[PDB]
């Protein structure tokens, strides 16, 4: 591989330049009002976000070296996790609310019809990210970790390759914290704190997932139908 040779500073720049954009919702003020229409906005938003994520994944160092089946597999497993950590990242500057889009800011009263429980878990996750002062450099590292780690445990030395890249992102996270001026103890503590949150992200993803193939009337895109059926069967 080649991504095993890039430095920590080069890893960050590669991830920052590969960052997907923050997308907007479907603007019409009437559709956030009810249940079906609101999930329609989120579904449409997630569908367009997936297209960016797929192409973002191709620019994630090491992901390209993976075989085609391994690439699809990792995306099939982590797609909702990556959407959620992005959502949680965007919602940091807005306590008590979830920023799905700059034109789609959700409060928990909207979540209390049709879901409230998952809403609060996302809020709490965004809350911890805020008071930890999560940096954009750290965030893009966490997203790449999710992409490579979530589906790796479902010749097979491609597993070893994935683990090698994961070790590099670990070095990168520590590199960023070291540059930020954190003491050695604070580094592995913050590292642990961030990675423990990934378990929470996985949790919220699984819970949100089983709502999605329970909601399955509220039309899902064929791409989204494909991503969910991988989690079912």
């Amino acid at each position: 591989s080649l991504a095993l040779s890039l430095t920590a500073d080069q890893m960050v720049s590669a991830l920052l330049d590969a960052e997907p954009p923050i997308l907007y919702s479907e603007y019409d003020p009437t559709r956030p009002f009810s249940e079906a229409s609101m999930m329609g906005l989120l579904t449409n938003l997630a569908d367009r976000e997936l297209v960016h994520m797929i192409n973002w994944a191709k620019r994630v160092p090491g992901f390209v070296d993976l075989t085609l089946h391994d690439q699809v597999h990792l995306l099939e497993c982590a797609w909702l996790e990556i959407l959620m950590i992005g959502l949680v990242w965007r919602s940091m500057e807005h306590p008590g609310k979830l920023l799905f889009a700059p034109n789609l800011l959700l409060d928990r009263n909207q979540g209390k019809c049709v879901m409230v429980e998952i809403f609060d878990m996302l809020l709490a996750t965004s809350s911890r990210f805020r008071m930890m002062n999560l940096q954009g450099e750290e965030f893009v590292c966490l997203k790449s970790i999710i992409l490579l780690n979530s589906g790796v445990y479902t010749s097979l030395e491609e597993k070893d390759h994935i683990h090698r890249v994961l070790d590099k992102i670990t070095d990168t996270l520590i590199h960023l914290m070291a540059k930020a001026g954190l003491t050695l103890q604070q580094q592995h503590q913050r590292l642990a704190q961030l990675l423990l949150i990934l378990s929470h992200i996985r949790h919220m993803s699984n819970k949100g997932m089983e709502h999605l193939y329970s909601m399955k009337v509220v039309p899902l895109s064929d791409l989204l139908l494909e991503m969910l059926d991988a989690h079912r069967l």
């Binding site: 297209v51 797929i54 699809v72 995306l75 791409l223 494909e226």
Partner: peptide, 9 residues
């Protein structure tokens, strides 16, 4: 697969 065809391009 669409995801497969989205990775194909």
């Amino acid at each position: 697969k669409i995801l497969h065809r989205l990775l194909q391009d």
